Amino acid sequence: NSNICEVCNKWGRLFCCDTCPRSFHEHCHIPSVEANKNPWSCIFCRIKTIQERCPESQSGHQESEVLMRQMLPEEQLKCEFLLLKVYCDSKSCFFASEPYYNREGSQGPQKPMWLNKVKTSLNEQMYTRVEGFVQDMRLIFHNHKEFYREDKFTRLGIQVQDIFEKNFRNIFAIQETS
Ligand SMILES: [Zn+2]
Ligand SMILES: [Zn+2]
Ligand SMILES: [Zn+2]
């Protein structure tokens, strides 16, 4: 197995996947690495299994259909994995914890949002459709862009949104378009 966490790229107290060489801190994996379970298989492996059991699941889909899906176990897992892919980027730090807004010439968002809030919401089964998870993820970056206006820091929102959107299209097999 790898000697660094797949998500944050640091060493420490690492749990190793039994079916692949990846490793994780407990609370870096989503869901948090499970207490017992031998063997244990990481989210990467669990997602690959879904794909292998239903190869047709990789055929192109419309985003509107994907958003309306209920959060049954496979869609719950897919959202967990998508959230984890965002945390894999180091720039996710800016969006992880609860923000605050005191900048001359800007007013904070009406509905603040952050990654650890989406993480808690997934863990508490608060989303009934994929749309609820995707709307809160997009709101993170939209709030950022609106608040920072012309400051070049706005770019961090565009960057992390792009990581979200590419991973969304991959994980939910969104039909490719020009
Ligand atoms: Zn980690
Ligand atoms: Zn694995
Ligand atoms: Zn099948």
Side-chain angles (χ1 to χ4, degrees), residues 1-36 38-178:
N1 288 69
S2 184
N3 311 326
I4 52 174
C5 178
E6 190 78 355
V7 184
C8 72
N9 301 104
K10 298 294 197 273
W11 183 70
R13 183 54 194 116
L14 301 175
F15 301 83
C16 293
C17 181
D18 289 312
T19 50
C20 85
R22 298 177 174 88
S23 307
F24 307 85
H25 302 106
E26 177 166 9
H27 295 309
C28 282
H29 197 270
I30 309 177
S32 290
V33 166
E34 293 79 6
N36 207 286
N38 318 59
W40 178 79
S41 267
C42 79
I43 191 153
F44 298 75
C45 286
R46 301 170 64 188
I47 288 287
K48 183 197 305 298
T49 296
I50 303 321
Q51 282 165 20
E52 291 179 348
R53 290 173 161 161
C54 289
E56 68 271 34
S57 72
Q58 304 161 283
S59 299
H61 299 75
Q62 300 296 111
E63 178 173 308
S64 62
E65 177 270 321
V66 165
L67 297 183
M68 293 307 311
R69 297 178 188 164
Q70 297 180 14
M71 291 282 261
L72 294 179
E74 287 191 354
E75 303 319 301
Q76 177 75 34
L77 195 73
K78 290 176 160 208
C79 296
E80 290 166 344
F81 186 50
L82 175 52
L83 183 55
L84 177 137
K85 287 290 200 155
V86 174
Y87 279 104
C88 289
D89 198 280
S90 64
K91 298 164 176 278
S92 69
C93 69
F94 294 110
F95 298 106
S97 74
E98 185 171 2
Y100 62 85
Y101 300 95
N102 196 359
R103 182 199 192 240
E104 182 181 333
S106 289
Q107 270 294 330
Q110 305 288 318
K111 184 175 169 177
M113 194 48 60
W114 61 101
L115 298 168
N116 292 350
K117 181 173 175 69
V118 180
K119 183 181 280 202
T120 291
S121 298
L122 277 172
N123 172 244
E124 293 186 1
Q125 300 162 303
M126 300 290 293
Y127 300 115
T128 57
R129 292 172 193 274
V130 170
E131 184 180 46
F133 167 82
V134 173
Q135 285 174 336
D136 274 354
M137 294 291 288
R138 291 173 170 165
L139 184 66
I140 296 172
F141 315 116
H142 193 265
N143 283 350
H144 177 99
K145 288 172 56 187
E146 295 299 304
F147 182 67
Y148 291 105
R149 309 277 207 126
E150 307 312 285
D151 192 296
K152 60 195 180 170
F153 192 62
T154 59
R155 180 158 172 265
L156 269 296
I158 291 167
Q159 294 177 318
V160 183
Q161 182 148 24
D162 194 44
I163 296 295
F164 175 71
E165 300 291 348
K166 287 181 184 288
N167 283 277
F168 174 69
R169 289 190 307 263
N170 180 259
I171 291 165
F172 285 96
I174 303 292
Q175 174 64 47
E176 289 279 284
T177 62
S178 46

